Symmetry: C3
Subunit: 314 residues, 3 copies
């Protein structure tokens, strides 16, 4: 069926950690997506600035949500102030470079192309301009969720989380604007490992929020470029894991691998209030390089699941 004969729907995309609403369609549609590539200076950590290359102004790019069988029409613009061309490779797309050749766009230009989402899953998209590693390492990646035809189960809370490793010339903590360091990248020796582009992006005042009793689903991406994440939530167990973001489901998992350029979906029920910490359990990444997020859960205590310190004695 030609895509021009399908009803046209403007995509609802979200900035991390938000997720677009679930799709209540039982028929294919032509989904129009607008993306802009912007090079901009942002805060990586306290007193540390970095020149990010972004989809739509932050890291990761905005999340896209479509249904298996949809045609995705992408209007791809590269901001005039950009120093280099950019494009996008959708791991959800079947064909040359996942769309990279069709979306090769110089600064001040706009490209359009479309692809059919043939297979459900949770797919990384990222820039593929040479040198690809640099474009990825500077923050050009995001997730597109392709729902199964029948949809996914309903859950109370959904979060959008993408891990990435960053390579600065100075050591972590070195102040000022820090340029990209190709040698550390080739050596796979990052200074920062973060969720959603920046240290503390989903921690402290920016923590994720939920209420006791709610079911939580996390769409977890790994833009890399290099590291593989042992993803874990302190204080919780994964009721379900879509292994490597695929169809296969594992259960009762404490820590699951997220491949580089890959993904995973994890689900768990937050039973009792508390502060839950997302980490890459290659643990020195979490507590020394920034691979640390927080989930605030409010509600009524339940001693039957866990008690506090009942006593301390000599």
């Amino acid at each position: 069926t030609p895509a021009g004969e399908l009803p046209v729907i403007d995509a609802v995309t979200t900035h991390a950690p938000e997720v677009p609403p679930a799709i209540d369609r039982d028929y294919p549609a032509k989904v129009r997506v607008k993306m802009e590539t912007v090079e901009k200076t942002m805060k990586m950590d306290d007193g540390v600035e970095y020149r990010y290359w972004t989809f739509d102004g932050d890291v990761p790019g905005r999340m896209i949500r479509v249904r298996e069988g949809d045609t995705v029409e992408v209007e791809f613009s590269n901001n005039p102030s950009s120093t280099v061309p950019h494009n996008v490779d959708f791991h959800a797309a079947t064909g040359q470079g996942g769309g990279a050749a069709a979306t090769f766009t110089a600064p001040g230009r706009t490209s359009t192309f479309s692809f059919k989402a043939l297979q459900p899953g949770l797919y990384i998209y990222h820039c593929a301009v040479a040198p690809v590693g640099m474009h990825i390492a500077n923050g050009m990646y995001g997730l597109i969720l392709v729902e199964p035809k029948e949809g996914l189960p309903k859950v109370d809370k959904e979060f959008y989380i993408v891990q990435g490793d960053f390579y600065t010339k100075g050591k972590k903590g070195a102040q000022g604007l820090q340029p990209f360091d190709m040698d550390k990248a080739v050596a796979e020796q990052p200074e920062y490992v973060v969720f959603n582009g920046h240290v503390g992006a989903i921690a402290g005042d920016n923590a994720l929020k939920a209420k006791a009793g709610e079911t939580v689903r996390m769409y977890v991406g790994n833009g890399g470029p290099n590291l593989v994440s042992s993803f874990h939530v302190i204080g919780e167990i994964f009721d379900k894991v879509y292994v490597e973001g695929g169809k296969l489901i594992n259960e009762n998992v404490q820590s699951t691998i997220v491949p580089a350029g890959g993904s995973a979906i994890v689900e768990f029920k937050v039973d009792i209030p508390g502060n839950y910490t997302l980490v890459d359990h290659s643990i020195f990444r979490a507590f020394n390089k920034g691979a640390l997020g927080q989930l605030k859960v409010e509600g009524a205590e339940n001693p039957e699941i866990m008690t506090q310190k009942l006593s301390d004695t000599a």
Copy 2:
């Protein structure tokens, strides 16, 4: 309320016996944190921080739906506080906040084991990486309500990476090296705390024809293990320690802060070698264990060298 049962815990590589119970119970566990100097390798000493005096901590075995009440003691000679985060526990820090214990003090708390699996537990005192890197980790097995299938031999194996200021082989007491840890460049990668801890005279033992199950933990702090047994194939793998079962696997990933269960039947006698198949860890950094199998040879499965010609 629930009947109270004293936990049977075991020092690696031993495993507690399977649970013959069909009802929930309150299982009492005693844990002590002890800082002590032990041998890492020939002529190399290390200041370990341990649960119950060695690395890994003692294995705990409970049943889905049990209440686990932990009596947590910190030796008076300890220099810092310690606690425990059970990946099996649901709630704040897996119990870390409730078990924050200064030297010479005892804490108690409890949690219900809601989900079966094989869960790492470890200290979570800041700086978390250092407490883990010094050896404070172990495994707790939460059986399914119906139990696990019977096997002849069960082993308790936990990999960890260690960071010494001196190069591997440097003699004497070797302090923890924060810079190498942050860089993820360990000097030692071992099973159960020390080079040779389950090799040579400390090898695991079985008999030909017996079914073997290994509960494999990875305390990290940083490395991911490509776990493999030289000379054998995994008939079953509980993927990442979860419910999903894989079969006919030669090498399986054990995530950092994660686990795996593998099963295989040892068909013929011989020495079978446990390794992290990121192989320079095994044969240069110490990630090497041995399973000695006794019994009658069988040429139909494998022969010795049949001929040597020019």
Copy 3:
């Protein structure tokens, strides 16, 4: 006893024909270990240690329940002994002890392939890591008794990490660098022994509409691959080379000393890139292959650039 059959082995990226046998057989395999200098990249030489003259070794294909008889020769020009450990073999060293062969000698031994799967084989002479790092690894496929599903194209792909004294790009003969190996800091990461071994004029080839299966091994010694095909999605993944099947996976882990099988149908023409998606390995260290697919375009699946405006 058993009928005797001479093995059909293949040079990468080719795969032996599927087995149309419904009965067990004695499959005779001849292997020779050869040390030889070859091109790693433009103007870069390396002293490879090989099974049968290249990296990886030739692929072996047998049926579950077969007896594999190996005639193992070590070329007289070799400087050290070599052997082979089959991850498919059950028993001492996977055959390493039985095939320990000095230069100019020949060893024979046999093993029964008890379990189906896709198994790494590699040399295990001390120092094991160096023998592997110099290129001594390959794959043996043990079919299930009922065989595998039919596919149009089958490819044989093995990733390996290499450790040279000089930085990648340094011209001339590059010796093995033990220090970088222990640090797991490779200069080259390649498919099938060399930069470009399956790219450009050596690219893999298929036709639009064909189903493709890749037998993907990771000889290591150290790295774990996030295997990905740019422009495609894995319809099927035999997780870690085992019996378990995943679907709709973009990137799958290949453990060190492990394997994976992936399947996908190439719908439209184009150049598809095999990479380790630890992406600096692909575009800076050489872990890059190409699958060129010819056929008729289909804008319904993907279009070219439809417009370029201001």
